[PDB]
């Protein structure tokens, strides 16, 4: 009808990057199944495939990744900005502020400083795409190293993208460092898995700002800021507290029985878009077993494994399509690598941004699509003469805010 | 725009010389060197738009009847763009060669004492006579910008 | 589903915060017309009206603006961040970066550390409202002064909101300055006319972000980024360059005949929203002539005045529904005060924030919000299949003639 | 000094002069070292730059 | 050093010590002055701080 | 730039160097890069004359 | 102490001031600050004499 609030009765714009068949879990990035890509390919391959609509060949792919490695030179002013925030800062806010600072530190990107000319040619578009796709990895890095109180590292030009990130993550001032190849491959696959999702809150904001005619850097800053929402990347802590509060492994069968009693929480079982199955589960389960092989185990991992094994057996979890989501094995692997809790979301940001760049190009090569204009249906008072604010009646004193100070206004009582 | 320049609404510079007309062999040699620099460094969008203008403008009757032959300026600027020179760096590059000419002229001028710079004459275009009165009786601007510090003090 | 072109379409949200009918020129903040408020009221009054849906009481408005002045204080860390920025960088980018840093430096309001319930309490919403409403003008003044390089002075706690901003802007770095009450009332009366306008990408984005349960700071930062560009209708630059090229009054007729001949552009006259008179136009005209009286004018200002006087009576403007907009007179006023032109949109973002927070609070309160999962229609290839790598085999090459001619056009190692 | 202006224009630390060439290609060796003192001038580029200098001589 | 701890808690840089007030007065001032050498905190609050100090001598 | 000059020098060379720097420190005032029509205003004439007169004796 | 100081005469005064300051840049090489005499110690006198014979070059 005229009132479609959640946009569930309308369609903003057509898309071609991929299709989500949530009922059957059928996902194909321009026709290629996600599992096929995650097994037989690498992150730059799929990124280029989304970005240019098709996969590149070996030559231009090599040149592209060469450029990606090249442009990794983060301005040091951004590093000083990172120094600015306290070390307790959540990494998401750090990344967002760094994103804005990276927007400003590049004058050749502001359309207001050059008019509407930077966004008409393929040259500047591709150049800024490659520029940003490179930086992110790094900034993140810093953020990680500054979490514990470490000096910034210098990205090198030795490795491939994911393995480059692993390098600058763990080099410790050792130029001859080369991380484990298996870990780099598994993180590359993980980057494949979180490549894109169809139009969401963040994607809607991204396309809004793209049509807004503003520098792409700040647009992506806002878009990734929209991913800060605990509804959009804060659900991992729910299952983490599930597997942490349960404590000892001897609490698992009684835990599931108490779940049957409508007493103990359930979370992470079954996707909210996928209700039947997902190949991501099996592929990342194999990857998780590989991770356990390479690094080891812990009480949390064994508790989770036995808990999911008992969950596959009980009928209360069988009949409600409660197969475990990718979040379980994801968080398991990420903490197994040695990643803090507060640091999970930032890495989730790293892949998705590529997709947000992709659609950013899309809506900019389509003019049928134009500036937004939301229609407002006003339901309040239509007309009323304004009373003298002084004659203004004095019969209401409600909602009583009346409270903001430092320990009951003691800050300046003298 | 080929019509537009002939419509006198938008002018065209980059073709010819205010002191050389027949020719400026410099234009030919830098055309050869521009072909060489395209071979040795590559092509960029301004480069093909420049060469397209070079081929197209000659066909139009304007430069046939008006006579404007691509000036050393065109090729020098495109080559400067090719060599990685920033946009603002051209004038100092033009300054580097001229120093030889100044040095030669300066040495020659110091060489010959017979050449002199006399005191040139002038013909006054002001009043031939006035007189000073004090100012108290002085019978009666935009010197300083206002609204910035004036409003600040207001 | 329903293809939704440029979002013009239907109404995806209904509210009770404002009403505007441009073709009828009626602007009533919750049923109260723009004239009745602008001619007499003050900015904090309309801010409170937006926040609470009703006029305040004396004591209510008193201690409300008192708390605003109290929270005028800005954190030291974000000031240090602003100092760490470069010098010649554009200032509204400084504004958005400072807003992000403010989001970081308020982990208390961060909901991701304390679940999706910290934004259900009544008092936290109000404290956030006051915090933002107070802290933004100080940031704007600090950036404007960073353009001049002087250290930002602490915000005085004894003047009105607009008076506080004017003092902050032109304190000369001491206390012995006295506010120009004429200019102060002009500016405060002006801010009424630039409150929340009709729905835009900014309001929809804020609604979505609040529905997602994110922290309010980052959402407002994104909204400011949405307003970053002048393509939101801000065309002060258009009339500015038109004045810069128009010359004196003598060489105006050629341009206007070209406009009639459809050879010269026309900007700042006629509205895509207003198809009639504008009360804002006459009010801002009175304010602008008062500005001209108080601070004088440059030749360009009288050029614009004569141009307006000749154009309004001309038939090509009466018949074509063409008439100066409030953008033109507002630009006149700010230029007369003497602001850097590139700094202009900051003045257009300071007062566009009351409605932002009003819609944010309203979206939080009503449980009519849902998951913002928009639809689409697939147009790509429905299915393909993977190719082997050796079965593999370029719009541009990065770093053209820069660090490449510096890598091969002199030597190779 | 012209080379110093070029190089400091990017904010990069300046460089020492060399003496094992003639004018134009020595200047180019000045221009491109990137901290590596084992550079050399591309002779075609050096010659074309020298001709560029000579055309606007006097 | 106590004042330095309090300052470094909430980000603020050090405070140079005023040298014209009593003991408690000195500390209480070094907490809330914000680098303003022209501030004078309460007499009653300083009196309270001195009493709390004497009630925890040893 | 004049304190960085050795004690043995000529002060009027100091004048000309500092005044060339004044040329540098006011890039907004040059007409050399904004065309030969920029200097058509009386206001810029007044500003340049008054600035030069104020600066030289100092 | 040099590298900017004026040279109105021969570096003789420069070198004299230089070694006068060398007399204090290594105060460990001093007999008047420990006990009452130290060059009566063979090991000191030896290390001293070695350095001072070799210190001048720098």
DSSP C160-200: -HHHHHHHHHH-TTSS-----HHHHHHHHHHHHHTS--S--
Task: Return the closest-CA partner of residue A372 out of A193, A130, A209.
Answer: A209
Give the whole-angstrom CA distance, residue A76 versus residue E25: 44
Task: Return the closest-CA partner of residue C12 out of C366, C377, C370.
Answer: C370
User: Which residues are CB-contacts of A79 (< 8 A; sequence separation ≥ 6)?
Assistant: A142, A152
Chains contacting F (3 or more CB pairs within 8 Å): B, G
A232 is catalytic: yes
Cβ neighbourhood burial of B121 (10 Å; 0-12, 13-18, 19+): exposed
> What values do phi and psi take at C177, rounded to 5?
-80, 145
DSSP, collapsed to helix, strand or coil, labels residue C7 as coil
Rounded to a whole number of angstroms, the distance from the CA of E27 to the nearest CA of chain C is 22
DSSP, collapsed to helix, strand or coil, labels residue C128 as helix
Q: CA gyration radius for chain D?
A: 12
The H or E element containing residue D54 is helix D43-55
Give the whole-angstrom CA distance, residue G53 versus residue G55: 6
> What values do phi and psi take at A53, rounded to 5?
70, -15
**Residue written as tokens 């050498």?**
E37
Q: What is the 3-state secondary structure (H, E, C) of chain A?
A: CCECCCCCCCECCCECCEEEECCCCEEEECCEEHHHHHHHCCHHHHHHHHHCCCCCCHHHHHHHHHHHHHCCCCCHHHHHHHHHCCCCCCHHHHHHHHHHHHHHCCHHHCHHHCCCCCCCCHHHHHHHHHHHHHHHHHHHHHHHHHHHCCCCCCCCCCCCHHHHHHHHHCCCCCCCCCCCHHHHHHHHHHHHHCCCCCCCHHHHHHHHHHHCCCCHHHHHHHHHHHHHCHHHCCCHHHHHHHHHHCCCHHHHHHHHHHHHCCCCCCCCECCCCCCCCCHHHHHHHHHHHHHHHHHCCCHHHHHHHHHHHHHHHCHHHHCCCCCECHHHHHHHHHHHHCCCCCCHHHHHHHHHHHHHHHHHHHHHCCCCCCCCCCCEEECCCCCCCCCCCCCCCCCCCCCCCCCCCCCCCHHHCC
A85-112 exposure pattern, b = at least 16 Cβ within 10 A, e = fewer: beeebbbbbbbbbbbbbbbbbbeebbbb
Residue in C67, C86, C103, C104 to test binding to A, most A beta-carbons within 10 Å: C104
Under an 8 A CB cutoff, do B44 and C406 touch? no
Q: State this model's resolution in angstroms.
A: 4.2
Paired with A19 in beta bridges are: A28
Helices (H), G1-58: 11-25, 42-55
Chains B, F in contact, 3 or more Cβ pairs below 8 Å: yes
User: Which residues are CB-contacts of B153 (< 8 A; sequence separation ≥ 6)?
Assistant: none
CB A256 within 8 A of CB A317: yes
Cβ neighbourhood burial of G27 (10 Å; 0-12, 13-18, 19+): exposed
Kindly state the tokens that stand for A139.
């900034």
Paired with B46 in beta bridges are: none
Please work out, in degrees rounded to the nearest 5, the angle formed at the alpha carbon of residue D50 by the alpha carbons of D46 and D55.
Answer: 150
Strands C13-15 and A376-378 turn out to be parallel
Helices (H), chain B: 2-6, 25-41, 45-59, 61-66, 72-82, 90-111, 150-153
Give the whole-angstrom CA distance, residue A5 versus residue A194: 28
Q: CA gyration radius for chain A?
A: 25
Task: Return the closest-CA partner of residue C388 out of E49, A36, E51.
Answer: A36
Cα C46–chain centre separation? 17
Cβ neighbourhood burial of C48 (10 Å; 0-12, 13-18, 19+): buried
Kindly state the tokens that stand for A188.
């590359």
Cα C264–chain centre separation? 29
**Residue written as tokens 């970066």?**
C97
Under an 8 A CB cutoff, do F43 and B141 touch? no
C383-410 exposure pattern, b = at least 16 Cβ within 10 A, e = fewer: ebebeeeeeeeeeebbebbeeebbeebb
For chain E, first and last CA: distance in Å? 20
In chain E, which residues have their Cβ closer than 8 Å to the Cβ of A413?
A: 42, 45
DSSP code per residue over E4-56: HHHHHHTT----PPP-SS-HHHHHHHHHS-TT-TT----HHHHHHHHHHHHTT
Give the whole-angstrom CA distance, residue A362 versus residue A156: 32
Task: Return the sign of the alpha-carbon dihedral for residues D4, D10, D14, D18.
Answer: negative
A271 is catalytic: yes
> Taking CA atoms, what residue in C is nearest to B86?
C402
Active-site residue identified among A327, A365, A397, A399: A327
DSSP C30: T
Kindly state the tokens that stand for C221.
């930062």
CB C77 within 8 A of CB A81: no
Give the whole-angstrom CA distance, residue C116 versus residue C119: 7
A170 is catalytic: no
Q: What is the 3-state secondary structure (H, E, C) of A323-343?
A: CECHHHHHHHHHHHHCCCCCC
What length does chain B have?
A: 154
Name the E strands within C361-411: none
Compute how many other C-beta atoms are within 10 angstroms of the C-beta atom of residue A65. 22
Compute how many other C-beta atoms are within 10 angstroms of the C-beta atom of residue A72. 20
F7-21 exposure pattern, b = at least 16 Cβ within 10 A, e = fewer: eeeeeeeeeeeeeee
- Confirm or reject contact between C402 and chain B (CB < 8 A): yes
Give the whole-angstrom CA distance, residue C301 versus residue C293: 12
- Confirm or reject contact between D30 and chain C (CB < 8 A): no
**Residue written as tokens 């300055």?**
C177
Task: Return the closest-CA partner of residue B46 out of B11, B1, B10, B80.
Answer: B80
> What values do phi and psi take at C412, rounded to 5?
-130, 95
Give the whole-angstrom CA distance, residue C202 versus residue A364: 19
Give the whole-angstrom CA distance, residue C359 versus residue C203: 7
For chain G, first and last CA: distance in Å? 14
CB A91 within 8 A of CB A147: yes
E15-54 exposure pattern, b = at least 16 Cβ within 10 A, e = fewer: beeeeebeebbbbbbbebbeeeeeeebeeebbeebbeeee
Q: CA gyration radius for chain C?
A: 25
Compute how many other C-beta atoms are within 10 angstroms of the C-beta atom of residue C41. 20
> What values do phi and psi take at C347, rounded to 5?
-65, -20
Give the whole-angstrom CA distance, residue A195 versus residue A33: 12
Q: How was this structure determined?
A: cryo-EM
**Residue written as tokens 């500015």?**
C240
Rounded to a whole number of angstroms, the distance from the CA of B152 to the nearest CA of chain F is 19
Give the whole-angstrom CA distance, residue B53 versus residue B67: 16
CA distances to C183, C282, C288, C297, C306 from C294, rounded to whole Å, are 8, 18, 10, 9, 19
- Confirm or reject contact between C107 and chain E (CB < 8 A): no
Active-site residue identified among C126, C170, C232, C314: C232
What length does chain D have?
A: 58
> What values do phi and psi take at A30, rounded to 5?
55, 35
**Residue written as tokens 């050792």?**
A174
Q: How many helices (H) and strands (E) does chain F have?
A: 2, 0
> Taking CA atoms, what residue in D is nearest to B102?
D58
CB C247 within 8 A of CB C338: no
User: Which residues are CB-contacts of F16 (< 8 A; sequence separation ≥ 6)?
Assistant: none
User: Which residues are CB-contacts of C173 (< 8 A; sequence separation ≥ 6)?
Assistant: C150, C151, C153
DSSP C11: B
Kindly state the tokens that stand for C369.
């919000």
Compute how many other C-beta atoms are within 10 angstroms of the C-beta atom of residue C282. 13
Kindly state the tokens that stand for C44.
């904090």
Task: Return the closest-CA partner of residue A111 out of F41, C230, E29.
Answer: C230
Cβ neighbourhood burial of C122 (10 Å; 0-12, 13-18, 19+): exposed
Give the whole-angstrom CA distance, residue E33 versus residue E21: 14
Kindly state the tokens that stand for B94.
């033009």
Of E11, E40, E42, Cβ closest to residue A413 = E42
DSSP, collapsed to helix, strand or coil, labels residue D57 as coil
Give the whole-angstrom CA distance, residue E28 versus residue A234: 42
Give the whole-angstrom CA distance, residue A139 versus residue A102: 10
DSSP, collapsed to helix, strand or coil, labels residue C326 as helix
Rounded to a whole number of angstroms, the distance from the CA of C401 to the nearest CA of chain D is 14
Give the whole-angstrom CA distance, residue C169 versus residue C167: 5
Under an 8 A CB cutoff, do D58 and B76 touch? no
């Amino acid at each position: 009808k005229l009132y479609d609030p959640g946009y569930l009765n309308t369609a903003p714009v057509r898309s071609s990057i991929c299709y989500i068949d949530g009922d059957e879990g059928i996902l194909r990035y321009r026709g290629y199944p996600i599992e096929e890509l995650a097994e037989s390919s690498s992150y730059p391959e799929v990124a280029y495939l989304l970005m240019y609509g098709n996969l590149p060949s070996k030559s231009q792919l090599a040149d592209w990744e060469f450029a990606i490695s090249q442009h990794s030179a983060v301005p040091q002013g951004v590093l000083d900005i990172i120094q600015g925030m306290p070390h307790d800062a959540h990494p998401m806010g750090v990344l967002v502020c760094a994103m804005s600072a990276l927007s400003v530190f590049h004058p050749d990107a502001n359309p207001a400083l050059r008019g509407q000319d930077l966004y008409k040619s393929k040259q500047l578009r591709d150049k800024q795409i490659v520029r940003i796709l490179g930086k992110v990895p790094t900034i993140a890095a810093a953020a990680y190293l500054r979490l514990a109180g470490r000096p910034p590292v210098l990205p090198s030009n030795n490795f491939s993208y994911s393995e480059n990130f692993l390098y600058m993550l763990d080099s410790l001032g050792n130029r001859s460092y080369k991380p484990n190849t298996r870990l780099a491959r598994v993180l590359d696959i993980l980057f494949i898995l979180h490549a894109e999702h169809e139009m969401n809150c963040s994607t809607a904001a991204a396309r809004h700002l793209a049509s807004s005619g503003v520098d792409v850097f700040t647009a992506l800053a806002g878009a990734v800021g929209a991913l800060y929402g605990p509804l959009h990347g804060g659900a991992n802590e729910a299952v983490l507290k599930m597997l942490n509060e349960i404590g000892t492994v001897e609490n698992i069968p009684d835990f599931i029985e108490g779940v049957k009693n409508r007493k103990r929480k359930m979370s992470g079982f079954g996707h909210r878009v996928y209700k039947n199955y997902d190949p991501r589960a099996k592929v990342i389960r194999k990857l998780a077993e590989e991770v356990f092989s390479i690094v080891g185990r812990d009480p949390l991992i064994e508790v989770a494994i036995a808990l999911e094994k008992a969950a596959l057996s009980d009928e209360y979890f069988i009949k409600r399509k409660l197969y475990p989501n990718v979040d379980f094995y994801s968080g398991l692997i990420y903490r197994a690598m040695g990643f803090p809790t507060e640091f999970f979301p930032v890495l989730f940001a790293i892949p998705r941004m590529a997709g947000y760049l992709a659609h950013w190009r899309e809506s900019l090569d389509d003019p049928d699509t134009k500036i937004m204009r939301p229609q407002q249906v006003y339901t309040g008072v239509w007309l009323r003469h304004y009373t003298p604010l002084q004659e203004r009646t004095v019969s209401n004193d409600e909602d009583k805010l009346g409270q903001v100070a430092v320990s009951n206004a003691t800050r300046r009582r003298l | 725009f080929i019509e537009g320049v002939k419509n006198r609404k938008r002018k065209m510079s980059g073709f010819g010389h205010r002191v050389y007309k027949n020719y400026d062999p410099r234009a030919k040699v830098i055309r050869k060197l521009a072909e060489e620099v395209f071979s040795i460094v590559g092509r960029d969008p301004l480069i093909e738009v420049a060469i397209a203008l070079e081929k197209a403008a000659l066909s139009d009757e304007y430069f046939i009847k008006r006579k404007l032959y691509p000036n050393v300026d065109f090729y020098s600027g495109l080559i400067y763009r090719a060599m990685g020179f920033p946009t603002e760096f051209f004038p100092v590059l033009f300054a580097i060669p001229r120093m030889a000419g100044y040095l030669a002229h300066w040495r020659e001028s110091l060489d010959d004492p017979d050449t002199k710079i006399m005191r040139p004459q002038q013909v006054y275009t002001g009043v031939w006579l006035r007189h000073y009165t004090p100012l108290q009786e002085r019978t009666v601007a935009v010197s300083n910008a206002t609204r910035r510090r004036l409003a600040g003090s207001r």
